Structure 1
Amino acid sequence: MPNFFIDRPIFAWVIAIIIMLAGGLAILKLPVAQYPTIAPPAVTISASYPGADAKTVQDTVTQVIEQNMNGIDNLMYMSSNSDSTGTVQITLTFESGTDADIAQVQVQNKLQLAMPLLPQEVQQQGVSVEKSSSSFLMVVGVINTDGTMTQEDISDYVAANMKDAISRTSGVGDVQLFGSQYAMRIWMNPNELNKFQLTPVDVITAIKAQNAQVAAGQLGGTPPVKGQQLNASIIAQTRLTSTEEFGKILLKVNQDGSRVLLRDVAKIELGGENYDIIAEFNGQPASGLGIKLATGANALDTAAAIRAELAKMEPFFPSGLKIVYPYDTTPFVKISIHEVVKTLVEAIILVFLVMYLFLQNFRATLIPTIAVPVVLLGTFAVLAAFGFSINTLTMFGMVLAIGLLVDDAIVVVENVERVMAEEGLPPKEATRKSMGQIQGALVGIAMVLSAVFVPMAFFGGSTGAIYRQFSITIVSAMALSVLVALILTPALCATMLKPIAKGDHGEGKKGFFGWFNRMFEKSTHHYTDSVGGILRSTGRYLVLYLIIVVGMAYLFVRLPSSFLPDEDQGVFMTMVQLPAGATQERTQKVLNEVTHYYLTKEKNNVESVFAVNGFGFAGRGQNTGIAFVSLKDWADRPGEENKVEAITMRATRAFSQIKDAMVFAFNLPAIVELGTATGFDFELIDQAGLGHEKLTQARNQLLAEAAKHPDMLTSVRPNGLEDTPQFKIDIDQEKAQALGVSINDINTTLGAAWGGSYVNDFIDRGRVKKVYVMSEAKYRMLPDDIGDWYVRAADGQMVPFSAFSSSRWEYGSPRLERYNGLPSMEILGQAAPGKSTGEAMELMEQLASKLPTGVGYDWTGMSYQERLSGNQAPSLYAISLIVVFLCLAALYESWSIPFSVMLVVPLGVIGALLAATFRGLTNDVYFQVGLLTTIGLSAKNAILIVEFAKDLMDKEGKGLIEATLDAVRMALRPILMTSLAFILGVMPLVISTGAGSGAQNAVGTGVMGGMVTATVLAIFFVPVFFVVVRRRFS
């Protein structure tokens, strides 16, 4: 094939142009996002029961839905939690590769059929089924600076005006309102209701009658009386539209004739659907929009379009309303793409310098300049064809490929330049021979590199999805580089290069290049003399190899492991947990101090603080809240002192002084979608209907035993909340029936007043919105207020709630968890310093076996993924290692010689581990992919030395040592040229302190350090390996 295109250079250009256009086309159509779909498909069923406790929600909603979640395909596990805010969330996680649309519709369909089994109040509110596994592109914040609008006023505006317009914007895949639109709030007064002998029952009944859409009919409707001329629709009673109309709602007409209206016995205003969450942005009232990227959409185009639409809305905003961007993931994607182009531009510039330093002719420096961009564009075409996207993982995959793409370009051109310099052939005849020496080897190298990376893509779950991004990108880039090396560069070499006279090594020149050529020719004789001496005493160098292999194993075990590196994302969170029974006001005072600290002591770092009172990830309530800290640009925060980790430590220590509150800061995970992914996720299951109280005692027992092993297990705590004091009220059935008071009127008056009641809908400025009746704050606070509420008996006498009720204090769960239908309690923890997560799980299983009868367990989330991933690893390494051997065995036509190549693997790994251990990094994905690439090129260097050495013995009949010494001499220059260019190419990635540095550091460190050793050791050890192996076997 190389011969075919040496004689047909225009054909070679056509294929190169076809590849370029395919790549250029692919670049335009290719999706662009920060990360691809890593987490397995998850469908979350969300329901709401206003004024309901955790147990009411669980026993009427959660359990009923869970029992009906059958006939659904490819379900791994089901998890749910029911809390005292009246909320339930059932997450169904599916097998990796499951269609998320088919998964959601199957879950949705089973819910629909289970809807008639749920309470009427839950059916009114409805039950949402959403794909929860998806993550946010950005969070658009909406604030009011002149204090003319509340969070309810802002929320309604965003919903009524902005939401649909942003939802319609090009590339937008989902928009969640951080708040609710207005609701008609009736704030009932018990003193006024009792005065007119009325109850919440009467208020609800009246609203349902006087705020309703009534069907009438038509004038002259069919079948008509013939002769009828006009046909008109009859409009009867329609929904109310204003607070005024609701105010005029008639409740009672007295004897004297005076009228009792709704405004007489209640305050009527537009407000929120709930008041559980209080959102503040730098202390000012705030709402916002959580925007998700659509499937196949371009993140940079989508965000630009979102800002463009908000810019057109700017002239129609009320005075004080402002747009802010506390969270935006596009700066990463833009930098990830920019630094990829920058790297590969600098890479081509670096090759040019090194190519001219050694070859000293511009005609030779242009062959890699053409070949490299062609292969890169080719990769984008294969990337698109396999349905992959331009993301952080695929982008750093191409940065790790350049070392292997550059090598192919140099090796081909350098070998032609050498053959001409030594034999004195014309470029055309020289290339034919030069390619003849390497064409069989490059095909062999291609098959080996495939066997290294391809099996890595066949990992299952989350880790397999991450590896697949690097695997396909490197294997594609590698594959195309070989085709371009067997088609284009041979044709280029034969036509573009200039003839070199036999024995012209550039020692006849003057100046710098004349001096350099003499130096290098002297250094080559020095090197070949060193190998000659090394091969006289192979025995001691085999000992020196085992020290490297033992030293490698030692470092590999002691190097701390972690999936992905912690990144400065310009955003982190501050959790605020107050004691059991703590109120909204108390939690706000703590959030105000957190906000005050960050805008005072971190004025030069923090841009804004988004204070969310009422919401937590570990559970909701008035006694929880999170502050989302938004930092300034990385260029306006120099040094490690002004980084997330530094600020995180300062904040944690600063808020340690605060009393009656657990306050601490922490950085976000590298991938928000996936989650923590550091430690284990344990589920403690009630397998024999033991109950909540007994499952708590078994949990406390497991935690107590975990605390007795600090050497193995660390920070082993429950994820859920603890039991809290709750006001138990017992309605006397006998006393109720005796006074002639119905239980419905009692349970309605209580539930409506204290809990709230969603009555029906009304239309506010052509927008259908909810009508809620509830007690005015001051009449539903303390147990003394219970007695102020009256219910009318059959005889018309008003009876106080105290007359037919008795109350006491008991403890109950404000958040009840369930795993796979059964009652559960989620326990988090991690392995102690030096210990692996796998070992920590072994003990947790052992401790769990000694728990009371009927108490089971299971592994969920990252733990479920790790175990099924750990089972695959051994089989994949084995497959990978067997095929590498089989390929090299076919290449060299020997079962023995392949070992000489495979013995170089530890030479690159030692340097990577030395670099990582020294710099204080972890055994992460970027590092692990960095090792596989380092092993790739180190093997590639050795493969050519062994092939050349073997061919000299087979063809020209040279001796073992003669051929080996001749091989290393010919191989020295192209090895040094490749290594020099690639080490300088990954220099910016190592020293990078700014944005996405955690990725670049993990990439650069392992590669650079590995390349240094893989270069310096291999040139002395490869000749030893080949000689020692050849001597042993025949």
Structure 2
Amino acid sequence: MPNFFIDRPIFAWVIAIIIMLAGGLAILKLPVAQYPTIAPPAVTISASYPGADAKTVQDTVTQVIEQNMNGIDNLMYMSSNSDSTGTVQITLTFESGTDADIAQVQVQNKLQLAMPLLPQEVQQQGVSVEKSSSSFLMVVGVINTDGTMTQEDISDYVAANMKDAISRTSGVGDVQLFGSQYAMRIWMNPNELNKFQLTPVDVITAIKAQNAQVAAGQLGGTPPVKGQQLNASIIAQTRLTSTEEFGKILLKVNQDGSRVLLRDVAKIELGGENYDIIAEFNGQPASGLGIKLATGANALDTAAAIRAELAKMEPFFPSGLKIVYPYDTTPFVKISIHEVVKTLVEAIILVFLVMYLFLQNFRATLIPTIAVPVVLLGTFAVLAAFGFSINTLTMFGMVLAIGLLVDDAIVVVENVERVMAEEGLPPKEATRKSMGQIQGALVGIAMVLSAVFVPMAFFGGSTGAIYRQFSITIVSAMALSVLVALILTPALCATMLKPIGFFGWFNRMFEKSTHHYTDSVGGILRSTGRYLVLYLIIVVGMAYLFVRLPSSFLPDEDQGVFMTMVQLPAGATQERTQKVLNEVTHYYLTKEKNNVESVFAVNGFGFAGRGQNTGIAFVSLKDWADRPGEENKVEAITMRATRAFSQIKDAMVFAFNLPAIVELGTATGFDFELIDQAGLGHEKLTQARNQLLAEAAKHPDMLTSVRPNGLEDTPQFKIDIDQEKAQALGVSINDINTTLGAAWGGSYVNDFIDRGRVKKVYVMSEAKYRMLPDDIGDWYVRAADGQMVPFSAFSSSRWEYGSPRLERYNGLPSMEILGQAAPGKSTGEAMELMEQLASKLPTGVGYDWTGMSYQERLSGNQAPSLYAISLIVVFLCLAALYESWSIPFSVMLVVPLGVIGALLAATFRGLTNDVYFQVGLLTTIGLSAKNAILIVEFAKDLMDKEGKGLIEATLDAVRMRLRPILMTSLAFILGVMPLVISTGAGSGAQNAVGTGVMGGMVTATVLAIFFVPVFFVVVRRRFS
């Protein structure tokens, strides 16, 4: 093939131009995101049954929905939780690779057949099925510095006009609101109800009857009489619009004749739909707007368009209403992409510099500066073809493959120049023969590197999607690099090259070093046998370092924002949790003035379950330019915040940093489900969980920080209605229950229309009449006659413990356990210990692994089998290249040499064994194997064609291969040196990649140049 393109430079140039155009078009038409889809598809069913506890919600909604969740394809598992706020949260997790649209529509159609079984209130509120995606892009915030309008007024303003305009931005159309629009609130008053002999049932009936749309037909409608000439629609009574119109609603007429309206009996206002969540922003009211990202959309373009749209909407804003951005990492993605592109361009520049330093030929130095970008653009085109996107993983795979691209582009030109020098030939003949010497070696290298990189895109589970990005990126880059080095680089060498005081000294010292190296290699071929023992020591040390290095998933890095979770004890109110959320934001805006830019404090929306004793304040820091030093990073700020929050003891405040992927984390951690499968009950399962927790606490050597992911039982106010006593007094059960629920839990009766937008109408007791158990004495229910029997007459009160959050796994009651393996031991034997402990539980209590422990359990053994297949295929490719069964062993013995350096670099800098380190290790061993392939191919070619002796051939081979190895190693080390020394602005990934790659490359370059010759000699002499 290279001979074909040497004679036809124009064809090679045309192919290169085609590749570059395809790559440019792909770059112009590739979606950009921080990370691709990693978590398996999940579909979430959310239901609201206001006024109900965990058990009522469970029994009436959750079980009914779960028993009808059958016949859905590719379902991995399902888990539901029912909260004491009246919320059903059912998450169904599917197999990876199944399109979530068909899964969501299947879940919807399967649920829509269970709607008639749900309570009327649950149906009326609505049940929402939606995909649980990680497309979370930005959090817009609308605050009111002017202090006039409340949080409800801001929420309604956001929902009325901003939401629709934002949802039509170029990009996403899916948005969420951190609040609720207006709702016509009717706050009753028990005293007026008792005075007028009225009940909340009467108010509900009056509101329903006197606010509704009724059809009325039309006049002149078909069939008409003969001679009809007029046809007009008829408009009957319409829905109410104003608060005063609801005020005029007549409840009853009095015996004497006076009129009773709602205003006389209740207070009518434009309140919120719910008051469970109070959002704040630096101590002042605010309303948020969560913005996702559409599939196949550019995150940067979407964020820019949304910001432009908000700026365009800004002029027609009322007083105040500044647009803030409490959570947005668009600039993080842009900074990371810019750093990656800077790394690539600096690598190209360093290749230019190194090539001119070793080869004093300006024309030759440039053959690789116009060939590597071609491979990069081809890689972009292939990524576009395979349906991938521009994310952190793909660009880091590209910066890892850049070293091998450089390796190829340098090897070809270096050997061409060496042939021109030694042989003294014109460029065309020299490059013709040069390609002949390295053309079979370049095809074997491609096969070997494909065999070592492809069998990691087939890892199962969530992490397999992470590995697939690197696998496909690097394999496409290598295939394209080999194609380019076979097509375009020979043509450039044939055409551009011209036949042939610090640089003189550099040449002299390099020649002296080459002579010394050749003498050393000749010497170590006579003392062979000690170096085999040294290699065995190296292998043992590599094994020790690999089994010593801790593991992880991805480096958590300073994104500029972090969270703080506040968890007051059970039974705490909203104002009690608001005080702590004020102690937290005051601390952040006082003790961290130079680092904290804003704090968004959501009250009632906790981390382990929404309520009133929970809250989360997420903090947006200033730009990384404004936070110099290691003490101004998120890691050094969260620890200080937690230390300062240890003092407050009435609550449990904990500041932490977001994970790299919100859907993953805690690679050493495990998730455990304790299920009851005999109908034991909630309390027996709680006792089993307590026993298992005690047993786990009795094993501090293996399991660390095992805790139940749930809420313990809390006191509850039980009202027991005597049926015989109620029937004796002539009061109906459906009236007692209705008045109790409407007064204390609220009741959504119907809808009204204001400002051209349908809104809800809620009836509830005024706050002061529903706060204490004794307030029950304020409420009277009308008997069969005009009496007003007190609640106290027919009911009794009690305090008893009940669960505020009941969770089920796969349709059965369950308890969740979060655990972590010991630092010195992996997470595989921790799962075994948890199984062994769970095996000693009361009869009827089983267990299960969920979340990421579910994936580990079934898809945690793919790696050894895939690597064995890779090694077998590498053997086959190398034996095919060398036409021998023993020679490939010499090539394969360069693997520990590259592994040990990466392991040493990881240990020295305190890094862990994450995905970046593993991919860098694979890159290092691939490059070292490629160098070994070239050396052994040259040596055996000298043996075969020229009939040289073994020592002479293996000495000349390293003599003429020394320069390219040093050139490529120096270029790659200088290219990734800034990655090692980099702090802030997404430096965790950069360090995790660069440290391992640099250490492995340095050690492999130092060791291979001495071990490949002795390996080849030992293989040739021991065999044959």
User: Do these two structures clear the TM 0.5 threshold for a shared fold by scoring above it?
Assistant: yes
Contact 2:134 2:662 (8 Å CA) reproduced? no
Contact 2:551 2:667 (8 Å CA) reproduced? no
2:173 is paired with a residue of what secondary structure?
strand
Q: For the residues of structure 2 that align with 1:962 and 1:677, how far apart are their CA atoms?
A: 52
How far is the alpha carbon of 1:153 from its aligned partner? Answer: 0.7
For structure 1, the residue ranges without an aligned partner over 5 or more in a row are 501-510
Q: TM-score, normalised by structure 2?
A: 0.99
Contact 1:278 1:613 (8 Å CA) reproduced? yes
1:811-855 Cα deviation digits (max 9, x unpaired): 000000000000011100101120111111111000000000000
Contact 2:135 2:294 (8 Å CA) reproduced? no
Q: For the residues of structure 2 that align with 1:639 and 1:246, how far apart are their CA atoms?
A: 61
1:915-952 Cα deviation digits (max 9, x unpaired): 11010010000000000000011111110000000010
2:439 is paired with a residue of what secondary structure?
helix
1:172 is paired with a residue of what secondary structure?
coil
1:102-124 Cα deviation digits (max 9, x unpaired): 00000000100000000000000
How far is the alpha carbon of 1:336 from its aligned partner? Answer: 2.2
Q: For the residues of structure 2 that align with 1:121 and 1:522, how far apart are their CA atoms?
A: 89
How far is the alpha carbon of 1:869 from its aligned partner? Answer: 2.6
How far is the alpha carbon of 1:134 from its aligned partner? Answer: 3.0
Counterparts of 1:107-506 in structure 2, within 5 Å, are 107-500=107-500
Q: For the residues of structure 1 that align with 2:588 and 2:65, how far apart are their CA atoms?
A: 44
How far is the alpha carbon of 1:674 from its aligned partner? Answer: 3.1
1:870 is paired with a residue of what secondary structure?
coil
Contact 1:138 1:290 (8 Å CA) reproduced? yes
For structure 2, the residue ranges without an aligned partner over 5 or more in a row are none
Runs of 4+ in structure 1 off by over 2 angstroms are 673-678
1:651 is paired with a residue of what secondary structure?
helix
Contact 1:713 1:831 (8 Å CA) reproduced? yes
Q: For the residues of structure 2 that align with 1:936 and 1:225, how far apart are their CA atoms?
A: 91
1:288 is paired with a residue of what secondary structure?
strand
How far is the alpha carbon of 1:427 from its aligned partner? Answer: 0.5
How far is the alpha carbon of 1:677 from its aligned partner? Answer: 4.4
1:49-108 Cα deviation digits (max 9, x unpaired): 010100010000000000000110000100000010000110000000111000000000
1:297 is paired with a residue of what secondary structure?
coil
Contact 2:668 2:821 (8 Å CA) reproduced? no
Contact 2:40 2:462 (8 Å CA) reproduced? yes
1:886 is paired with a residue of what secondary structure?
helix
Q: For the residues of structure 2 that align with 1:369 and 1:779, how far apart are their CA atoms?
A: 79
How far is the alpha carbon of 1:488 from its aligned partner? Answer: 0.3
How far is the alpha carbon of 1:366 from its aligned partner? Answer: 1.3
Contact 1:340 1:396 (8 Å CA) reproduced? yes
Contact 1:34 1:329 (8 Å CA) reproduced? no
Q: Which moved more, 1:662-671 or 1:1-10?
A: 662-671
How far is the alpha carbon of 1:808 from its aligned partner? Answer: 0.7
How far is the alpha carbon of 1:242 from its aligned partner? Answer: 1.2
1:280 is paired with a residue of what secondary structure?
strand
2:377 is paired with a residue of what secondary structure?
helix
Match of 1:848 among 838, 854, 865: 838
How far is the alpha carbon of 1:676 from its aligned partner? Answer: 4.6
Contact 1:61 1:119 (8 Å CA) reproduced? yes
1:737-780 Cα deviation digits (max 9, x unpaired): 11111111100100000000010000110000110000000000
Q: For the residues of structure 2 that align with 1:932 and 1:518, how far apart are their CA atoms?
A: 36
Q: For the residues of structure 2 that align with 1:497 and 1:960, how far apart are their CA atoms?
A: 34
Shift in alpha-carbon separation, 1:232–1:677, aligned structure 2, 3 A: farther
1:626 aligns with 2:619: no
Q: For the residues of structure 1 that align with 2:855 and 2:561, how far apart are their CA atoms?
A: 27
Q: Which moved more, 1:377-386 or 1:331-340?
A: 331-340
Contact 1:135 1:673 (8 Å CA) reproduced? no
Q: Which moved more, 1:358-367 or 1:7-16?
A: 358-367
Q: For the residues of structure 2 that align with 1:387 and 1:736, how far apart are their CA atoms?
A: 68
Q: For the residues of structure 1 that align with 2:661 and 2:908, how far apart are their CA atoms?
A: 26
Q: For the residues of structure 2 that align with 1:263 and 1:871, how far apart are their CA atoms?
A: 71
1:657-686 Cα deviation digits (max 9, x unpaired): 112211111111111133554400000001
1:178-224 Cα deviation digits (max 9, x unpaired): 11111111111000111100000000000001111111110111101
Give the structure 2 partner of residue 982 of structure 1.
972
State the superposition RMSD in angstroms: 0.8
Q: For the residues of structure 1 that align with 2:172 and 2:219, how far apart are their CA atoms?
A: 46
Q: For the residues of structure 2 that align with 1:677 and 1:290, how far apart are their CA atoms?
A: 28
How far is the alpha carbon of 1:576 from its aligned partner? Answer: 0.7
2:113 is paired with a residue of what secondary structure?
helix
1:373-395 Cα deviation digits (max 9, x unpaired): 10000001110001000111001
Q: For the residues of structure 1 that align with 2:913 and 2:577, how far apart are their CA atoms?
A: 40
Q: Which moved more, 1:6-15 or 1:167-176?
A: 167-176
How far is the alpha carbon of 1:255 from its aligned partner? Answer: 2.0
2:476 is paired with a residue of what secondary structure?
helix
Q: For the residues of structure 2 that align with 1:134 and 1:770, how far apart are their CA atoms?
A: 31
Q: Which moved more, 1:343-352 or 1:326-335?
A: 326-335
Contact 1:347 1:982 (8 Å CA) reproduced? yes
How far is the alpha carbon of 1:579 from its aligned partner? Answer: 1.0
How far is the alpha carbon of 1:25 from its aligned partner? Answer: 0.7
1:843-883 Cα deviation digits (max 9, x unpaired): 10000000000000000111011222312112111111111
1:401 is paired with a residue of what secondary structure?
helix
Q: For the residues of structure 1 that align with 2:163 and 2:763, how far apart are their CA atoms?
A: 27
Contact 1:336 1:395 (8 Å CA) reproduced? no
Q: For the residues of structure 1 that align with 2:610 and 2:25, how far apart are their CA atoms?
A: 49
Contact 1:394 1:469 (8 Å CA) reproduced? yes
How far is the alpha carbon of 1:256 from its aligned partner? Answer: 2.2
Contact 2:605 2:615 (8 Å CA) reproduced? yes
Give the structure 2 partner of residue 536 of structure 1.
526
1:975-1023 Cα deviation digits (max 9, x unpaired): 0000001101001111110211000001100000111101001111111
How far is the alpha carbon of 1:133 from its aligned partner? Answer: 2.9
1:752 aligns with 2:742: yes
1:660 is paired with a residue of what secondary structure?
coil
Contact 1:730 1:807 (8 Å CA) reproduced? yes
1:951-986 Cα deviation digits (max 9, x unpaired): 100110111111111011111100000000110100
1:275-316 Cα deviation digits (max 9, x unpaired): 111110101101111111111111111101000110111011
Q: For the residues of structure 2 that align with 1:31 and 1:133, how far apart are their CA atoms?
A: 17
Q: For the residues of structure 2 that align with 1:598 and 1:488, how far apart are their CA atoms?
A: 59
How many residue pairs get aligned? The number is 1024
Q: For the residues of structure 2 that align with 1:584 and 1:328, how far apart are their CA atoms?
A: 28
Shift in alpha-carbon separation, 1:936–1:860, aligned structure 2, 3 A: same
Q: For the residues of structure 2 that align with 1:764 and 1:440, how far apart are their CA atoms?
A: 78
Give the structure 1 partner of residue 776 of structure 2.
786
Q: For the residues of structure 1 that align with 2:775 and 2:415, how far apart are their CA atoms?
A: 94
1:21-71 Cα deviation digits (max 9, x unpaired): 111111111111111000000000000001010001000000000000011
Contact 1:43 1:93 (8 Å CA) reproduced? yes
2:111 is paired with a residue of what secondary structure?
helix
Q: For the residues of structure 2 that align with 1:390 and 1:562, how far apart are their CA atoms?
A: 24
1:877 is paired with a residue of what secondary structure?
helix
Contact 1:135 1:672 (8 Å CA) reproduced? no
Contact 1:183 1:273 (8 Å CA) reproduced? yes
How far is the alpha carbon of 1:361 from its aligned partner? Answer: 1.5
Contact 2:553 2:666 (8 Å CA) reproduced? no
Contact 2:26 2:380 (8 Å CA) reproduced? yes
Contact 1:607 1:631 (8 Å CA) reproduced? yes
Q: For the residues of structure 2 that align with 1:173 and 1:919, how far apart are their CA atoms?
A: 44
Contact 2:552 2:666 (8 Å CA) reproduced? no
1:22 is paired with a residue of what secondary structure?
helix
How far is the alpha carbon of 1:640 from its aligned partner? Answer: 1.2
Contact 2:55 2:806 (8 Å CA) reproduced? yes
1:484-514 Cα deviation digits (max 9, x unpaired): 10000000001101112xxxxxxxxxx1111
How far is the alpha carbon of 1:1030 from its aligned partner? Answer: 1.0
Contact 2:143 2:321 (8 Å CA) reproduced? yes
Q: For the residues of structure 2 that align with 1:620 and 1:696, how far apart are their CA atoms?
A: 21
Q: State the identity %.
A: 100
Contact 1:463 1:869 (8 Å CA) reproduced? no
Contact 1:40 1:133 (8 Å CA) reproduced? no
Q: For the residues of structure 1 that align with 2:264 and 2:664, how far apart are their CA atoms?
A: 54
